[PDB]
Amino acid sequence: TQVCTGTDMKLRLPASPETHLDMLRHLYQGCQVVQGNLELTYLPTNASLSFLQDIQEVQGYVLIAHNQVRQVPLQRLRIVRGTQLFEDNYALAVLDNGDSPGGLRELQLRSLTEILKGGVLIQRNPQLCYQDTILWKDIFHKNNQLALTLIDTNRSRACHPCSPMCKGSRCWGESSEDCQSLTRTVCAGGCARCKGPLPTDCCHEQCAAGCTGPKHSDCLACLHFNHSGICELHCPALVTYNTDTFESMPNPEGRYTFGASCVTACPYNYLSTDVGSCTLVCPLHNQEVTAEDGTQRCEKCSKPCARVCYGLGMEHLREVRAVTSANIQEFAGCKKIFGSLAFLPESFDGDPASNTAPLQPEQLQVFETLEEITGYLYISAWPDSLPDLSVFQNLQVIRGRILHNGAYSLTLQGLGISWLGLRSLRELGSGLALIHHNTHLCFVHTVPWDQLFRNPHQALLHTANRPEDECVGEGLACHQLCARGHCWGPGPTQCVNCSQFLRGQECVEECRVLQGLPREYVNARHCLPCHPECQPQNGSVTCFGPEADQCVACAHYKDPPFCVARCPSYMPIWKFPDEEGACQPCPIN
């Protein structure tokens, strides 16, 4: 692992404070490049944050706020790009970390030498020292040097001086390795970055943050793209043109853009583009296409793009908080939803101004054809009359290309449900699953969550559900027939896999091949009904397939090859029964 997405909770409180820190651990453990915002908030004093050791680059902003922890270890963070900015102004925001006393004492951002866009906002940090000391202007990129800088220096403690090692008295802390290294105001000539005051110390044009040498392979960071160790302005195109005829030919060295990287293939759960990019949404004249292997590409609609079902946070539903009776009809007939679904308490309170009744449990059956959600599924309210989430029985994938609060692809909280019932769900493409405070919910332990996940940054965070010891104690375990003890709820229609046979969607021990009515045949472990014109057999099988010509023997008459109830009575046909049961044509024309 080197790349991980960020979050998008800003200053909102975690709904499950008991599982917030393991959420951050699962996200950032081993991560080196945060492709989003690094948000560290509401962390207690004794919080172990070692899993942040390896972060070198943040593509969005860094938000460090409302913490009691005395130190966040980001000594290796080299560059903040600021493609997004907190409050639309700041690549780095350190706020309200305080109130031995708690609160951040030192920033210790000893490798932070580049902010491409955005400013610095440091406010209300009573225990913080040395922030007034950094030459922030050396850190900003030349194209970002009127970036705002709002730095509160009010403290509740005295600071030791910087180490005598720091000769500019510029430091991130009191240690000798906390001195600020200047990479831009020091440089000879007009170089953007250097390793020293001579012009041989200057860094290649394609470097950001600094360099260990003058080549475009000695950068500490790439200003545009990391092409297998070489910092470059763009990736090699996927097609090159014959210099004489300008016919397209596929470039063997071509790459896709992916963040600030050039890569051979788009990573799992991303879309490839004809333009040569890896995205999470298609271009506008485009549609998604899935290949043999599971790969999904964004290929241009050869004609007008056919209609698609959009979810919340998408197109006309972009600003819509929740599914309500006002918009439930929008999902009628949908197999695949481009966007997300959120069920909030307000989902089940109607709008009496327009005499619109609240969302009724029967309307939710609109989702019973739903097989894929490209975004997330968030459920924080559900009708108490509904035992489970079975109107989502047919949901196969939650891709999680959009995550709630930037982290969770599946959230269930505060519900009355007694089991899940997502019997078809077999992949959470990305993101975490958070299941908490569902007092009556059993059958959480019974789900094989590891087979749903696709990357190791994923896990199930769960708390304050029904204790499994009561579930076991009341006999709410998987059905005997559920293979490996994996199931989504009670009974024989909730197994993930079936140890014997399947009739419809119920697991059964045997099919009615020899005993029972209607007699059946088996195909791929499925019980399927013989044609009703097959005569049932005592001591043998009754049919070899579904059709009337696959009977062992006919129950009434035979119109060869078919077992028929009666002889029928383009050529107009008139037939009568032979004494052996066969249908012959009539000879009268």
Epitope: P560, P561, F562, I573, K575, A582, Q584
Partner: antibody
Framework: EVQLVESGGGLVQPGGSLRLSCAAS????????IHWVRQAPGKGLEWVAR????????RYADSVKGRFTISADTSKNTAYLQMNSLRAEDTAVYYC?????????????WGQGTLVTVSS | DIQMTQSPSSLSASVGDRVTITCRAS??????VAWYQQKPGKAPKLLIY???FLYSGVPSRFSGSRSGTDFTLTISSLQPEDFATYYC?????????FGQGTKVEIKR
């Protein structure tokens, strides 16, 4: 007036795929069964596959099971033979024929055949 | 799986002569037998369905008869246009199976 027109044959490399199409006209394929019968050059008729488009039930000959798949589009009133993993022995004129009706299980109408040639 | 064995594989008869083609089933196939005519490079054409019924539009010099598992196509007055390969077929069971065919050449 009943008619069946096949298309999609031609040359294909051994191992390669091909898909023939039978455009039915003057009748609905949902009312009867549709067959593919083929004839290698200078040889006899070989029944190959059958489909009941009402419900898509299919049946195949031993010589083609696991490689050929017959299907139907009732909206386009067409049937299709998808031939994968082809061999030189499969080289033949492929005919599409129908069964006459509900109680008429002789092949009354035939298209005039598309020749599939399997060669490097 | 029921086989249809056709005999002879080829015959030569003169114009106006009575020609008998024989086709024997490996089991009881009842009357589910059809006879087709095929001229070179052409689609086969239905001549007789249900063993002994003449299909509409076909000349009456074509008859079919049945004797147990033995099925006989007869052309009572061979005409030059009757040069073709003739095939028998069973549809008593699935799969339907064709005979090997009989080539009829006119001797003049």
């Amino acid at each position: 007036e009943v008619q069946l027109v096949e298309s999609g044959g031609g040359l294909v490399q051994p191992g390669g795929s091909l898909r023939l199409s039978c455009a039915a006209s003057g009748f609905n394929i949902d009312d009867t069964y549709i067959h593919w019968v083929r004839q290698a050059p200078g040889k006899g008729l070989e029944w190959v596959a059958r489909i009941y488009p009402t419900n898509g039930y299919t049946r195949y000959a031993d010589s083609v099971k696991g490689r050929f798949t017959i299907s139907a589009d009732t909206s386009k009133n067409t049937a299709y033979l998808q031939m994968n993993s082809l061999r030189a022995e499969d080289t033949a004129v492929y005919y599409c024929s129908r069964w006459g009706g509900d109680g008429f299980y002789a092949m009354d109408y035939w298209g005039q055949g598309t020749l599939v040639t399997v060669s490097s | 799986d029921i086989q249809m064995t056709q005999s002879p594989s080829s015959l030569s008869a003169s114009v106006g002569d009575r020609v008998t083609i024989t086709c024997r089933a490996s089991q009881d196939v009842n009357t589910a037998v059809a006879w087709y005519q095929q001229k070179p490079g052409k689609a086969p054409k239905l001549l007789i369905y249900s063993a002994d019924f003449l299909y509409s539009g076909v000349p009456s010099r074509f008859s079919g008869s049945r004797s147990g598992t033995d099925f006989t196509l007869t052309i009572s007055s061979l005409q030059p246009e009757d040069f073709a390969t003739y095939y028998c077929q069973q549809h008593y069971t699935t799969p339907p199976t064709f005979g090997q065919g009989t080539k009829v050449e006119i001797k003049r």
